[PDB]
Design a protein around this ligand. Structure first.
Ligand SMILES: Cc1ccc(CNC(=O)C2CCN(C(=O)c3cc(Cl)ccc3Cl)CC2)cc1
Ligand SMILES: C[C@H](NC(=O)c1ccc(C#N)n1C)c1c(F)cccc1Cl
Lengths: 260, 271
């Protein structure tokens, strides 16, 4: 179960924009978030470690693997796999992705979210920043803000992807349909190549009042069946929105016949 | 959803195959029907049989077969699965003799993806073999349990007196063992002989004469002749199969372990 790491395992560690590049002795390049550095904490190590164990049980080709956890005297860090091309929005913005690649990106997003929901894991904050892209344009879904992990989160454009049921009511526990809304605005982002809603306080009333992204800003050719999908995936009533198994059953045929 | 309980009237026609039968549904298209029992009207095992069909319908993944429905009628019991056009894996290997390494590598990766799902649900496949690896029109695969190994109640309903109707892939621990208690490693052994079959385009052990000659010789160390598959199998796949068919099961890896290494190898070398 455990891969408890030590700081000693890493030869060097170059800082990033507390996220940090880190070269492991036997295992190569990795990315390390040191979430806390301070006094020796009250005994929540077991809780933190059990939570890290739960992150580590999430093992799937389209989901990021937590490779290890470092809990030293006044130093708490998590360690993940190195993804070369970074987040999805950076890949969309940096230079001209083909429809075949984006279609596959969508299929891998669906495959990954389906796994997550299949493990009883709702993603509270799904968005392009949380979709990391490797060297060969294959993706992995991530929770870089630690939204779903309560204890690590406590130890430390997000409103745009959040469902209107949550904009109304902060006490509302999310569901499988919460993420399908997010997935819809992700789809729009994938064909718009930009973050939506190009003021913060004012916008929240409009979205709860029915507003969605401007579809006429998708100046790139997006297929009708994908535009159909996002409209359905962002419906205001959650019971109207499909499940990810329902989306996969339809979209996998569509990918292979038309997109691939 | 639940399982769709179907009626016989739902199918327009049903032509027999190698009791497996091709069957066209009214609204829902071409399907394959295994009619497991036809005889007198059975004792109330229906609830159990239906519960069993419900339970095996929870097994939902891109690389395993969907039970589409179940027919429970007076003295006629059938399961209905999805139609896979190119048939089982060995039929694809033999009838083509035309399959690229890239496609075979992908077929292996799909077998790994599927077995990983099954084991991830706590389901051991007792009888894994090429006959149980079904191939669609686009050479994509789905794993199946056509002998009803994992379906205890339906398998018992077949063997019924009243009804009017593997050794090559078996791990040596299970050879000559009536109390064969399977593990995740049971399937990995089978997976190894499957890999060999994928590159040999044939069943193993074609110079074996007696059955007891085969069973004892395998338990005494024998595997499929690797000299049949130096015609082009990569060394890393031959390495894998040797490892996956090791006589001590503790040496053999898990399917997640196989996937972590093999998926990189597929994309860099094979695809
Ligand atoms: C809902 C859901 C979806 C997918 C997953 C799969 N695992 C994860 O995302 C890990 C969460 C923990 N983590 C990090 O905090 C992290 C963040 C940065 Cl910027 C850099 C380095 C690190 Cl180590 C690693 C990745 C978990 C939950
Ligand atoms: C998920 C798959 N399902 C069938 O094999 C299946 C579906 C329909 C029929 C029929 N007839 N079968 C055997 C399956 C199991 F349920 C149990 C064990 C292995 C596998 Cl591969």
């Amino acid at each position: 179960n455990v891969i408890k790491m030590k700081s000693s395992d890493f030869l060097e560690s170059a800082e990033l924009d507390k996220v940090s590049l880190a070269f492991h002795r036997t295992q190569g390049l990795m990315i390390m978030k040191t979430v806390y550095k301070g006094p020796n904490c009250i005994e929540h190590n077991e809780a933190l470690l059990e939570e890290a164990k739960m992150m580590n049980r999430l093992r799937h080709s389209r989901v990021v693997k937590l490779l290890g956890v470092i809990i030293e005297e006044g130093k708490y860090s998590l360690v993940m796999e190195y993804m070369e091309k970074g987040n999805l929005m950076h890949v969309l913005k940096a230079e001209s992705t083909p429809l075949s690649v984006k279609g596959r990106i969508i299929l891998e997003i669906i495959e990954g979210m389906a796994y997550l929901h299949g493990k009883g894991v709702i993603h509270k904050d799904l968005k392009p920043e949380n979709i990391l892209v490797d060297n060969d344009f294959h993706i992995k879904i991530a929770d870089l803000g630690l939204a779903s992990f309560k204890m690590w989160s406590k130890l430390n454009g997000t409103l745009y992807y959040m469902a209107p049921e949550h904009l109304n009511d902060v006490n509302a526990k999310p569901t499988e349909k919460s993420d399908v809304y997010s997935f819809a605005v992700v789809l729009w982002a994938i064909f718009a190549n930009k973050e939506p809603y190009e003021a913060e306080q004012q916008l929240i009333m409009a979205i709860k009042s029915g507003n969605r992204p401007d579809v006429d800003d998708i100046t790139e050719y997006c297929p009708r069946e994908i535009i159909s999908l996002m409209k359905l995936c962002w419906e205001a009533n959650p019971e109207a929105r499909p499940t990810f198994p329902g989306i996969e059953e339809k979209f996998r045929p569509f990918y292979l016949s038309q997109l691939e």
